[PDB]
Design a protein around this ligand. Structure first.
Ligand SMILES: O=C1C=C2C[C@]3(O)COc4c(ccc(O)c4O)C3=C2C=C1O
Length: 329
């Protein structure tokens, strides 16, 4: 009586019919550039797996961004590199311009195109209804592209969506957690930022797919139209599901668990409780109503679904009425 198996309903066998070299990143051999071509200018951010700097290619004065990795097994590094190369040129996919060996850290440094970004914490406050629809559509292009190429991003969140607003330019970044989708494979559920983790991860259902990114995207849309970032703010992974259940309701959550025969952790019994499904309108107020429309709520509703199989795919989402004006251009 284990969980019921699941398969992506789209792009199911993209990797199954690709040459082994496309998805077998462990066998990938890195082509190293020259580190002396770059000079670090300013540290933009520091993470657990790396440090990012604003740099200059001294051979042409071009501004670039350098991500210096910390020691972390070649396999993990190769995966990110292979995924970046496979997706390079894709719509709104961050461009990996070079790969060098940092002499000081003795670790690989990934060189990316530079995006004159506007921190989401500030930007998200000035966005208009049309802006949100436009950027959502652009993110969807990136996701349909990577998904169509057999890759799940697994870390979709505001911070990983760089936006040069004046140029209406967007880039989906940080593919460090991305992975190749193979039907029937059980994946690590310890991915994505807590606030953007899909129900499947929170209930430990390992046979997930591209649909995971759609939930994370839905979380972003909600935070944007309702002006509450993050929308689902849990204290931990357990409480995260509780925050989701307080909105989507426990009825559909349990229907989801039953459908896939998922065994709920013992420490999930007395915290989920019982909650009715709240109407999206309950989150609309004077300060955000100008970003909400029947179209936006219908779209959000088709993204934030417990059952990963019932969520819209990136391609289907692009056909939603919410984007008619954007499509029209
Ligand atoms: O491929 C990329 C590219 C970037 C460019 C950038 O776009 C710059 O700025 C950043 C940052 C990450 C963290 C951070 O704090 C920050 O400021 C970046 C990346 C991460 C990636 O995986």
């Amino acid at each position: 009586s284990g969980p019921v198996p699941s398969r992506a309903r789209v792009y199911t066998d993209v990797n199954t019919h690709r040459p082994r070299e496309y998805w077998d990143y462990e066998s990938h051999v890195v082509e190293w550039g020259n580190q002396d071509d770059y000079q670090l200018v300013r540290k933009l951010g520091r993470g657990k797996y790396s440090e990012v700097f604003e740099a200059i290619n001294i051979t042409n004065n071009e501004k670039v961004v350098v991500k210096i990795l910390k020691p972390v097994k070649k396999k993990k590094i190769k995966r990110e590199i292979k995924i970046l190369e496979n997706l390079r040129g894709g719509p709104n996919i961050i461009t990996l311009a070079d790969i060098v060996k940092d002499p000081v850290s003795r670790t690989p440094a990934l060189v990316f195109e530079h995006v004159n970004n506007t921190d989401f914490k500030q930007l998200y406050q000035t966005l208009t209804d049309y802006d949100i629809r436009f950027y959502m559509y652009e993110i969807l292009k990136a996701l349909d592209y990577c998904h169509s190429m057999g890759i799940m991003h697994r870390d979709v969140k505001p911070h990983n969506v760089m936006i040069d607003h004046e140029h209406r330019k967007l880039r989906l970044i940080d593919w460090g957690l991305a992975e190749f989708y193979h039907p029937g494979q059980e994946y690590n559920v310890r991915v994505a930022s807590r606030y953007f983790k899909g129900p499947e991860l929170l209930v430990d259902y390992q046979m997930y797919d591209y649909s995971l990114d759609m939930w994370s995207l839905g979380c972003m849309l909600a935070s944007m139209i309702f002006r509450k970032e993050p929308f689902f703010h849990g204290h931990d992974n357990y409480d995260q599901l509780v925050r989701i259940a307080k909105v989507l309701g426990t009825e559909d959550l349990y229907d989801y668990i039953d459908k896939y025969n998922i065994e709920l952790d013992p420490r999930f019994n007395d915290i989920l409780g019982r909650h009715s499904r709240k109407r999206w309108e309950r989150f609309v107020h004077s300060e955000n109503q100008h970003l909400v429309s029947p179209e936006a709520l219908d779209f959000l509703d088709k993204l934030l679904r417990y059952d990963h199989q019932s969520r819209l795919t990136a391609r289907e989402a692009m056909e939603h009425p919410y984007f008619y004006t954007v499509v029209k251009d």
